[PDB]
Design a protein around this ligand. Structure first.
Ligand SMILES: *C(=O)CCCCCCCCCCCCC
Ligand SMILES: *C(=O)CCCCCCCCCCCCC
Ligand SMILES: *C(=O)CCCCCCCCCCCCC
Ligand SMILES: *C(=O)CCCCCCCCCCCCC
Lengths: 121, 122, 41, 41, 41, 122, 41
C-alpha cells in the first residue's frame, strides 16, 4: 500500500524522483495503521529486493549504483516491456493461453462432417 | 540453490554479517539454477533455429550460446547471508547483472529480427 | 525514518539513496510459483 | 526457387523433397516459454 | 470384496483399514502435466 | 596492376598463353590495387564509427575489417593473358568474387543499419 | 541522460563536456565516397 502508492514501475526509458521528497511525502499519505511507519528501514531492506526502482545509496562512496540489484534479478529483467517486442512475458502467455483453448474445448475439428456427442461441445 | 551469490566481507571464514553479496562493477552474480537454464536455452534454441535466415540477410551475428552470458564463480548462494550459508556451491554457473542485461536485450533484439521473418514464413 | 544502524545493511534516510524507476527492470517478487498436482509432482 | 547451393543443407527445388503432413507430428516451434515472475525465478 | 491375497499388498476387506479424510492431504494424482510446445521443449 | 589475377595453367613457364584467370570454388580473385582499398576502407571506416550504437542495440556483429574479405594470393594480374604477363605480383591482396559479394552486401546491410540511426542523430 | 558508465568512453551528462563550434573544424563524416565505374575500377 506504500510501494505501489507511488507507481515504482514505468515501461519506457527512466524517470527519477528525488528521494528526500518522496519519503517526506509518504510520511504523510500512509494511514496511521500501516507497518511501513513502524519499521521504515526494516521494510526498506525488504523492499530494495522487490523494487529495482529503489536503489539504496552505497555506504562507502555515499552514491546510488546505476544498476539495481533486486533479488528477482532475472525475472524482473524478463518482464520489462522490451521495446523490440512488447513484452516476452505477455506475448508468450497470450500464445500458450490460446494453445490451451485450441486443444482443449476441441476447436480443432470445428466443422467436422460426422456425428459428434453433444458432450464433445 | 537460488538467488545472488555471496562471499564474506572481512575475509577468512564467512559468518553471517561476514557475508555480503559479491557485488562487482558489472553487477551481482545471480545463480542460474538448473531449470532457469532450460528457459534461456529454450529461448535461444528457438532463435538459433533461424540461423539460415540470419546469414542470408547479413543481420544477426553468429549463433547465441547461453554460455557466453554466464560465468563459473563459486561461493555461497542464497537469498540472504543467513540462508545463503547453507548452499555452498563450487564453480556454479552464475550470470552477472550487466550480463542478465544482454542475454535480455539480445534475446529481445534477435526476437524482433525473427518475429518478422517468422511472420512471412507463416 | 529515525536512524536504526545495523538491523538491516541500509538506512532508509541513509546517505544518497535514490528512487528511480527504469523501464528496464519491472519490480517483481515470486507470485506465480507452480504447485498444481501434475506440475509439482 | 533458383538454385542456391550451400547457404543452407537443402535446396528448396532440390531433388525428391516432399510435402506430406502426418497426423503424428503436429508442427510446432516454441511459443509457450514460461517467463512469469514466480516461474522464471 | 472377496478375499484375493497377493495380487496387491492390501486386501480391501482387510483387517483394520480406515476411510478417514484429513483436511491436510487433499487426494490428487497428476492431471496438470505440462506438454505445451514451448514448455515441453 | 589491376584486374583479375591469372596463373600459369601450363605450370612454371608463364607465357602469353600458358596463363588463365585463376578461378575456382570462390569465384575469381580480382586484384585490390592501392587506391581501391582506400574506398572500401573509407566505406568501412564510416561504419566502424557507429560502433557504440551497434553494441547498444545488439545488431551489427563486431567491427568490419577489410582484411576479412581479401586474401594473399600471388601470380600475374592483368586484364588479359597478354597484358597480365607484365604484372607479376607476389602476395598481392586480392578479393575473390564470392567475397566481393559480402564486402558488398555487408557494407549494404550495415549501411542500412547506420543510415537509420545516423538519421536520428542528425 | 542517465548515467551509463562503460558502454562508451564518454558519459553524455559527464563532467565538463562542452558544446562549442569553431569555424575551424566544420563537422563532417564521409558522404562523397567515390564508387562510379571508372573511378572504383
Ligand atoms: C520514518 O519512518 C519516517 C517515514 C519514512 C518512511 C516510512 C514509510 C514510507 C516509505 C517506504 C520505504 C520502504 C518501501 C516503501
Ligand atoms: C523460388 O523462390 C520460387 C518460389 C518457390 C518457393 C517460394 C516460397 C513458397 C514456398 C515456401 C517454402 C518454404 C516454407 C513455406
Ligand atoms: C467386493 O467387491 C464387495 C464390494 C466392496 C468394494 C467394491 C467397490 C466399492 C469400494 C471401492 C474401494 C476402492 C476405491 C473406492
Ligand atoms: C538523457 O537521455 C536526457 C537527454 C539528453 C540527451 C538526449 C539527446 C539530445 C542530445 C544529443 C546528444 C548526442 C548528439 C546530439
Amino acid at each position: 500500500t506504500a510501494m505501489t502508492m507511488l507507481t515504482p514501475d514505468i515501461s519506457a526509458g527512466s524517470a527519477s524522483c528525488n528521494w528526500k521528497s518522496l519519503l517526506a511525502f509518504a510520511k504523510d499519505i500512509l494511514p496511521l495503521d500501516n507497518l511501513c511507519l513502524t519499521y521504515p528501514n526494516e521494510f526498506y531492506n525488504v523492499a530494495i529486493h522487490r523494487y529495482p526502482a529503489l536503489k539504496p545509496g552505497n555506504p562507502d562512496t555515499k552514491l546510488p549504483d546505476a544498476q539495481a540489484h533486486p533479488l528477482g534479478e532475472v525475472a524482473g529483467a524478463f518482464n520489462a516491456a522490451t521495446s523490440e517486442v512488447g513484452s516476452l512475458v505477455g506475448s508468450s502467455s497470450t500464445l500458450s493461453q490460446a494453445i490451451s483453448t485450441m486443444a482443449g474445448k476441441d476447436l480443432d475439428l470445428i466443422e467436422a462432417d460426422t456425428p459428434l456427442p453433444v458432450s464433445v461441445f | 540453490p537460488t538467488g545472488k551469490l555471496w562471499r564474506p566481507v572481512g575475509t577468512s571464514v564467512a559468518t553471517i554479517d561476514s557475508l555480503a553479496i559479491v557485488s562487482d562493477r558489472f553487477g551481482q552474480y545471480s545463480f542460474v539454477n538448473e531449470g532457469m537454464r532450460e528457459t534461456f536455452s529454450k529461448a535461444l534454441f528457438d532463435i538459433n533455429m533461424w540461423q539460415p535466415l540470419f546469414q542470408a540477410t547479413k543481420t544477426g551475428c553468429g549463433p547465441i550460446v547461453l554460455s557466453s552470458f554466464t560465468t563459473t564463480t563459486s561461493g555461497y548462494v542464497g537469498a540472504t547471508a543467513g540462508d545463503a550459508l547453507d548452499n555452498p556451491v563450487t564453480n556454479g554457473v552464475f550470470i552477472s547483472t550487466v550480463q542478465i542485461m544482454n542475454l535480455q536485450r539480445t534475446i529481445a533484439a534477435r526476437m524482433r529480427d525473427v518475429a518478422l521473418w517468422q511472420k512471412h514464413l507463416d | 525514518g529515525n536512524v536504526q544502524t545495523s538491523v538491516n545493511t541500509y538506512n532508509i534516510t541513509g546517505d544518497g539513496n535514490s528512487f528511480t524507476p527504469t523501464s528496464d527492470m519491472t519490480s517483481t517478487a515470486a507470485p506465480a510459483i507452480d504447485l498444481k498436482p501434475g506440475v509439482l509432482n
